[PDB]
Amino acid sequence: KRPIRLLPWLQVVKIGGRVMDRGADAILPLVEELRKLLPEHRLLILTGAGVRARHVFSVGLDLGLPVGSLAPLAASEAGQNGHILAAMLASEGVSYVEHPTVADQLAIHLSATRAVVGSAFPPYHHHEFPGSRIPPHRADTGAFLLADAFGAAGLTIVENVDGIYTADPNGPDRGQARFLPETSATDLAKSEGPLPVDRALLDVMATARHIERVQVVNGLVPGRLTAALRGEHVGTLIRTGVRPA
Amino acid sequence: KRPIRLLPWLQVVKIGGRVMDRGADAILPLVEELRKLLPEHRLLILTGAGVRARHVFSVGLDLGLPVGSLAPLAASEAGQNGHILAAMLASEGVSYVEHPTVADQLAIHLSATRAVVGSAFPPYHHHEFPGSRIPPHRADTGAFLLADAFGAAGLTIVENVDGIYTADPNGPDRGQARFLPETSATDLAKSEGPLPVDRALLDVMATARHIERVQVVNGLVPGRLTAALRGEHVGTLIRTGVRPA
Amino acid sequence: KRPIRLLPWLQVVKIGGRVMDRGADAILPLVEELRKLLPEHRLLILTGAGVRARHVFSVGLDLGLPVGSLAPLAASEAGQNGHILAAMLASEGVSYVEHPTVADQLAIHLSATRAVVGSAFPPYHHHEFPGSRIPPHRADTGAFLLADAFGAAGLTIVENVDGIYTADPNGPDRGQARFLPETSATDLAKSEGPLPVDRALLDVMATARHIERVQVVNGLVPGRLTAALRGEHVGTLIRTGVRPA
Amino acid sequence: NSTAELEELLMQRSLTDPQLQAAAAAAADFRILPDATVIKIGGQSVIDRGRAAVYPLVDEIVAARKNHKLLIGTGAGTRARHLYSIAAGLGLPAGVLAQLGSSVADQNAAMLGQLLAKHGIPVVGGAGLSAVPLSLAEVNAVVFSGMPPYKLWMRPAAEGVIPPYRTDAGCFLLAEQFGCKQMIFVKDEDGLYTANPKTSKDATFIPRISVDEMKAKGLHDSILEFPVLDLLQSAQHVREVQVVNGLVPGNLTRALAGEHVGTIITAS
Amino acid sequence: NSTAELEELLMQRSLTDPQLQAAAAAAADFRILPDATVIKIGGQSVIDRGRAAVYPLVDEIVAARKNHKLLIGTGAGTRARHLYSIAAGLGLPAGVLAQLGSSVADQNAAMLGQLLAKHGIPVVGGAGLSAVPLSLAEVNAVVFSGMPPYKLWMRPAAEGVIPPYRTDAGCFLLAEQFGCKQMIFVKDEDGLYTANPKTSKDATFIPRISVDEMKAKGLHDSILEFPVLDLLQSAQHVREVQVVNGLVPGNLTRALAGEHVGTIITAS
Amino acid sequence: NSTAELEELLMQRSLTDPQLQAAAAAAADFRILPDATVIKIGGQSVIDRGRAAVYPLVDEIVAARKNHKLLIGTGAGTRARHLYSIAAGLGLPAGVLAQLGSSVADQNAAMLGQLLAKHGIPVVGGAGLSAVPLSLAEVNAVVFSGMPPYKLWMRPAAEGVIPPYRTDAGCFLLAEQFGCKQMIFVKDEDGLYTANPKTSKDATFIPRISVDEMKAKGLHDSILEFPVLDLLQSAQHVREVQVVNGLVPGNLTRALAGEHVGTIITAS
Numbered sequence A, B, C: 001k002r003p004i005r006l007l008p009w010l011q012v013v014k015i016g017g018r019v020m021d022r023g024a025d026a027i028l029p030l031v032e033e034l035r036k037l038l039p040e041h042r043l044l045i046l047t048g049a050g051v052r053a054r055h056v057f058s059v060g061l062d063l064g065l066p067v068g069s070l071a072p073l074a075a076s077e078a079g080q081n082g083h084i085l086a087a088m089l090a091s092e093g094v095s096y097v098e099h100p101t102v103a104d105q106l107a108i109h110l111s112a113t114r115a116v117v118g119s120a121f122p123p124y125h126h127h128e129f130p131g132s133r134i135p136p137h138r139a140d141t142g143a144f145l146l147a148d149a150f151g152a153a154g155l156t157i158v159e160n161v162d163g164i165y166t167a168d169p170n171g172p173d174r175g176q177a178r179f180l181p182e183t184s185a186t187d188l189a190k191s192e193g194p195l196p197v198d199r200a201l202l203d204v205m206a207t208a209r210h211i212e213r214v215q216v217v218n219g220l221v222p223g224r225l226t227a228a229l230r231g232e233h234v235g236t237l238i239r240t241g242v243r244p245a
Numbered sequence D, E, F: 001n002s003t004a005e006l007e008e009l010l011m012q013r014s015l016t017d018p019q020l021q022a023a024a025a026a027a028a029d030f031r032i033l034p035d036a037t038v039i040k041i042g043g044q045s046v047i048d049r050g051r052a053a054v055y056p057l058v059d060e061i062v063a064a065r066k067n068h069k070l071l072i073g074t075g076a077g078t079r080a081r082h083l084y085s086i087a088a089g090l091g092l093p094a095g096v097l098a099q100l101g102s103s104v105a106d107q108n109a110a111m112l113g114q115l116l117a118k119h120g121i122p123v124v125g126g127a128g129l130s131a132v133p134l135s136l137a138e139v140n141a142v143v144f145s146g147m148p149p150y151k152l153w154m155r156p157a158a159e160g161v162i163p164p165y166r167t168d169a170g171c172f173l174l175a176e177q178f179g180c181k182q183m184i185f186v187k188d189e190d191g192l193y194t195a196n197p198k199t200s201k202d203a204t205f206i207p208r209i210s211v212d213e214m215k216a217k218g219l220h221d222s223i224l225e226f227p228v229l230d231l232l233q234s235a236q237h238v239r240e241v242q243v244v245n246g247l248v249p250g251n252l253t254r255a256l257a258g259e260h261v262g263t264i265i266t267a268s
């Protein structure tokens, strides 16, 4: 049978780096919403990287650096977003916790306080996989690997758009972009074209053991994160293909 | 007068590495018993090393390595047992904590949560004492040094046998092995022959300042650990020769 | 406008290294007073260095070492004082926490327990400023930088004298030393002559954003720390020149 | 293409955008340690065997580092299998087993490193660069633990909780990301056979084979972790690997000299 | 004065006592790394520009370390400015921004260090000595991140929340406290001008100037962090610095050879 | 005996079993750093004395490392005694004092190491191997803090809370476990006397003595931590130590050259 759930009562929330990139205008309402959620859920809040990782990719690729060099360079930006977000929640007892602490001591930290913040990137470092010159295991992927390894009650991905569309809704084909209320990871993996989530997220969903659904919701709309953590359908649901025991 | 007690309300429990070696059949009932004890006691749970340290001793000795090399190699196996045991208690808020954290931050960690797990080996590393080719300061010894330094309310040693016998009850002289309900460390130190506890444990008992009795109980019998933590006599009591103030 | 307060509910208490130097006669009553304050306040207790730093300055200066070498050598002594003080409060759930932990994880640690102890020295290390051969950013300075950066509710400096005098009250001009119940940092900075607080404390007070007053009180008189944390005037008040929003 | 066009895509598109992925693929290719060779010393196949296997390899490492820059990774072996068995029986997930396996590879690195210390060769951390550049320049070799640092973020296999990326994968990925010239796996068989030589009488030795040919013969999981074969097909810098028998005296030395001992597995 | 008299003051007086301060000032003066040069490679001015700027400087570093011991610190640049902007807009204080800026300088150190790794030059921690003595003795150079380690204890500026002590200050303080012989800032302009050359048509080049003269001309915050100018006036060991254009091929090499390229800024 | 018989006992018996203990005693004996000498520089006896004592020893270390591989450990001294006094008066246990003493030995290592840094000699961690193999191969010396890492697990003495295993024991144990060829304690007296030379008029110098003879003369706790004498009797590799006066110019140099300055204390 499947492995046990280590932290079955845990809710994992991944905050997009590009949400953080919007600054106070986006972060202050999200922090207020997170504050209200602290008494309702036990939260592991994981931040992605955003635009600064694109800059370091631009420099690193111009220098010729391999994908195992670019991966920790990008992960650093997710960590900086996590320190920023944690600083905003410090007065609620929330702090940033490092990867080794998340890996081995999360249980005690969530006993001390209602939420902690960490980096959503996984620590693949120079052991990132070759193939693409862009690190494949990024913030969505790391957050899901963690949530599923813990057997958490859910993973909610907080985006700067309503969810997944059939095309980039801020891109050249924006006009034909249709919103997808629900999809399966296997269907997404068959599609070509951009997504708001890592392609590697769909791969780790295929080998997942616990998380059956991940919702992508618009963190720029107050209340959607709160609704999503109660299972209300306010963004795109991704079925992982895990089925119940 | 004797040094103060740093953590007088602490109960220290040392889990034998060979108990862990039995796998789920032994570990699951022990984890269930530990879960029930979390609301009753403030627990520092320390794991020993077991059979994997014997393998690394076999390799290391074949390579000629000195006792200061073998000591951290064995300690690593106690740490792995601690990570395994902590993972099983994670949903109760229990995590593994590293040696420096145990040494300097145990008070805050036991304020955050009811129990933590650590390695029972002491960090003697390459400063292990010479003499024997087998590291003398092992899991029983480290657990006692810690319990007595903290001035803890007790140390209970959880074994794969009922207690100490006059001979190895799984050995060649098993037939003449008589169970010892109670003994003194000084008497044990005078005896030759194997024991279920480190010989160095008897030495550190002689210089102990607080712990007057250590009970060795069979962790393979559900309820003996619970009884022992209430001071009920269900295994072998070792009198350290500390006397009350 | 001014930066937000990260930990507005925090009280910071700096314990002079020379108070610690007096040993049990001074430390035991202070520990008893701190114990009684744990249920009243959320405390960050920061220890200074005291006489041992003077010894290492004597050796280091005799060896010709620059001020960036002497700064971490002195900071080590404040850390040792912090470990001593924390050990005395361990049975109350209090532990020493390292500088990186204070900088990034203080919120979660004060959620786990009522108080923590750290080093009052800032981690300037070999990046200490040149000019004086004596490290300028010492225990008072580090404690204030932290308290003001956090936006803490106060910083109280616990001394071996009643407060600031017009001359060293244990020095050659002791006879003309007049007690100063209240002063401003700018006035002190204009005075020449010794003070019981770092000269650099007055400099960081000039750029402070939150802390309006710091009281220096005699930790050798039981009850003055307790009174000072309630805002009662029992030592020297230093006005920083911050004004309310 | 151009740097400006790549930077534009990098700012404006998702990293998943195929157009962005294609422009990044045209970037220049820097090899960080192009003159170094990565060697994996097997845990079960070599170090677990003790003095008779390890001491001759120590002698070869010492002789080889005069003419060759070496990154020497260690396997895990029977103690990791014991830990995997305990943890798997408890229902623990692959991410938990990954950390347990890494401590066994660490133990093996420390034992090998202590035998090499008097020759100046240090044990260094495996996650990245650490003391590698300085040591490679001075003493021409370092020892590291071969387990990848994925810990709780280890990708699970399709079935079971055994971490699929273990010390073959760890050593291979470092060779690949440092752009090393050569990757040698040191095991306890002369190379790849058409069947497991320990449990097959009539297995035939294979001097050279591609990954695709291996898969077409059922040998996907044989002398190398099958995930390593897929990593090899995606590699930018290390497009073949060599598997040699470390129990044959001089086999490592001869492999470093360019002799075709063992089996050469090619990406294509 | 005497050691006994200094020790007496050290035991009996506050460290604030002017008599104690004066006796400590008479102590002998040991230079820890007197033969080394500290170089700062600008973040915005060099590393952010990519290959065209960085690769020639890598070549110069490699050539220079044959005759010169080098401590090479990195700046932060545009990613730090982005982080400062986000955090400042949230009301975060200078001590929080300081830690964010340090991670960008760390990124730049890692990128530069990976280009130098095959030449044996490591990336080392910047807070102090670390692997510096051994590396300087063997491979004659190290790379470090230039941000000072003040973190939440960063002194704020008089106005605003931008950390005033950034990577110019960090590199300068290490040169000063190690007693290095020379401090070279590598930026993207030939040196100091009477006005910002990027936004002024008629700026005039200044080959040599004192800190006091700079302040009398409004140039307190120009090509160097103004706090660095005050640190320089208080310095014991490094009483002048040189600012050179790293985009000019050979400029670093020529500066290390004693050529007066760029601007020499003197403490007095 | 045989490896199989030892492995059988190792699997089947308690480690306390005398038969297992005896078989392990027959194992081969590898010396990790057989050509190195461990030197302890006293805290109270040397470093606390400042320039007049330390600078000549720095010169000797620099001259000696051309012909000798050196591991240089530091003592703690008067600041540790102050900390022990404060903590003991509070009722704190030996395990707490042990950590306090280690920070003073660390301070002394940093001061000594900064005087040696321009000669390439680093300060390294004392718990084990760290940067020792690489540094010993290149610059022939390292500095480390001499306190053992036992921290809260320090064995207490029979009486009192002073840690019995301090920097003499720490340095000795590293010499023993690395299998070094020589262990030299550098103190402030010519060697062992029949009484404490600082408080006895008529003490007689002892050039050579065994541990047993020392105990029969009441000298168990004299110029060396008495626990070190018992460690020496149990040692496998270092069966004698030499105690020399570091205040005599050239005494360390001459001791390294094989001259019998000072006192040789033998295990038997």
Ligand SMILES: Nc1ncnc2c1ncn2[C@@H]1O[C@H](COP(=O)(O)OP(=O)(O)OP(=O)(O)O)[C@@H](O)[C@H]1O
Pocket (backbone or CB within 6 Å): A015, A016, A017, A018, A019, A047, A048, A049, A050, A138, A139, A140, A159, A160, A161, A163, A164, A165, A166, A167, A168, A169, A170, A171, A193, A194, A195, A196, A197, D013, D014, D015
């Ligand atoms: N099919 C799609 N559906 C929705 N958004 C898409 C799609 N394809 C591309 N996008 C783009 O992805 C953007 C989100 O960008 P991205 O996923 O890189 O940011 P992020 O998740 O905040 O960053 P990080 O991965 O660092 O956390 C959306 O604003 C949208 O423009």
Ligand SMILES: Nc1ncnc2c1ncn2[C@@H]1O[C@H](COP(=O)(O)OP(=O)(O)OP(=O)(O)O)[C@@H](O)[C@H]1O
Pocket (backbone or CB within 6 Å): B015, B016, B017, B018, B019, B047, B048, B049, B050, B138, B139, B140, B159, B160, B161, B163, B164, B165, B166, B167, B168, B169, B170, B171, B193, B194, B195, B196, B197, F013, F014, F015
């Ligand atoms: N006199 C004795 N009384 C009881 N058991 C003994 C005695 N002598 C030997 N033994 C053996 O010791 C075994 C326990 O082994 P051991 O003490 O090595 O394991 P452990 O405590 O689980 O391991 P670790 O020390 O790594 O925690 C018992 O099962 C028994 O066979």
Ligand SMILES: Nc1ncnc2c1ncn2[C@@H]1O[C@H](COP(=O)(O)OP(=O)(O)OP(=O)(O)O)[C@@H](O)[C@H]1O
Pocket (backbone or CB within 6 Å): C015, C016, C017, C018, C019, C047, C048, C049, C050, C138, C139, C140, C159, C160, C161, C163, C164, C165, C166, C167, C168, C169, C170, C171, C193, C194, C195, C196, C197, E013, E014, E015
């Ligand atoms: N103007 C002054 N007013 C009061 N005390 C003064 C003054 N000038 C000097 N002092 C001296 O300063 C002493 C306090 O010393 P100091 O400030 O060094 O100790 P501390 O604060 O305990 O140490 P640390 O800074 O390491 O925490 C007082 O006992 C007094 O003798």
Ligand SMILES: Nc1ncnc2c1ncn2[C@@H]1O[C@H](COP(=O)(O)OP(=O)(O)OP(=O)(O)O)[C@@H](O)[C@H]1O
Pocket (backbone or CB within 6 Å): D041, D042, D043, D044, D045, D046, D074, D075, D076, D077, D078, D166, D167, D168, D186, D187, D188, D189, D191, D192, D193, D194, D195, D196, D197, D198, D219, D221, D222, D223, D224
């Ligand atoms: N077709 C095959 N050809 C050769 N060897 C095979 C084949 N199939 C299976 N094997 C077995 O695979 C083994 C190599 O894997 P093994 O795990 O022993 O190496 P390892 O690197 O020591 O692993 P670790 O280092 O993790 O312990 C060989 O000992 C061999 O018996």
Ligand SMILES: Nc1ncnc2c1ncn2[C@@H]1O[C@H](COP(=O)(O)OP(=O)(O)OP(=O)(O)O)[C@@H](O)[C@H]1O
Pocket (backbone or CB within 6 Å): E041, E042, E043, E044, E045, E046, E074, E075, E076, E077, E078, E166, E167, E168, E186, E187, E188, E189, E191, E192, E193, E194, E195, E196, E197, E198, E219, E221, E222, E223, E224
């Ligand atoms: N009077 C002046 N003379 C020369 N340059 C000036 C002057 N005033 C302003 N500058 C500007 O200052 C810049 C140098 O500062 P800048 O922050 O770019 O360097 P940096 O070291 O790369 O910073 P970082 O490393 O933190 O990114 C020059 O590019 C120049 O445009």
Ligand SMILES: Nc1ncnc2c1ncn2[C@@H]1O[C@H](COP(=O)(O)OP(=O)(O)OP(=O)(O)O)[C@@H](O)[C@H]1O
Pocket (backbone or CB within 6 Å): F041, F042, F043, F044, F045, F046, F074, F075, F076, F077, F078, F166, F167, F168, F186, F187, F188, F189, F191, F192, F193, F194, F195, F196, F197, F198, F219, F221, F222, F223, F224
């Ligand atoms: N019989 C004896 N012969 C020689 N010296 C003795 C004797 N008995 C006591 N001593 C004293 O022991 C001292 C050596 O111990 P001491 O603690 O000073 O050395 P240390 O290595 O500097 O200690 P630390 O390094 O921990 O400060 C000598 O200074 C000497 O005065």
Ligand code: MOO
Pocket (backbone or CB within 6 Å): A097, A098, A101, A105, A109, C105, C108, C109
């Ligand atoms: O990172 Mo922590 O381990 O808050 O107790």
Ligand code: MOO
Pocket (backbone or CB within 6 Å): A105, A108, A109, B097, B098, B101, B105, B109
């Ligand atoms: O290891 Mo921790 O220090 O749980 O806060």
Ligand code: MOO
Pocket (backbone or CB within 6 Å): B105, B108, B109, C097, C098, C101, C105, C109
């Ligand atoms: O130092 Mo800690 O981070 O008590 O959880």
Ligand SMILES: [Mn+2]
Pocket (backbone or CB within 6 Å): A016, A140, A159, A196, A197, A198
């Ligand atoms: Mn996204």
Ligand SMILES: [Mn+2]
Pocket (backbone or CB within 6 Å): B016, B140, B159, B196, B197, B198
């Ligand atoms: Mn036992």
Ligand SMILES: [Mn+2]
Pocket (backbone or CB within 6 Å): C016, C140, C159, C196, C197, C198
């Ligand atoms: Mn003071």
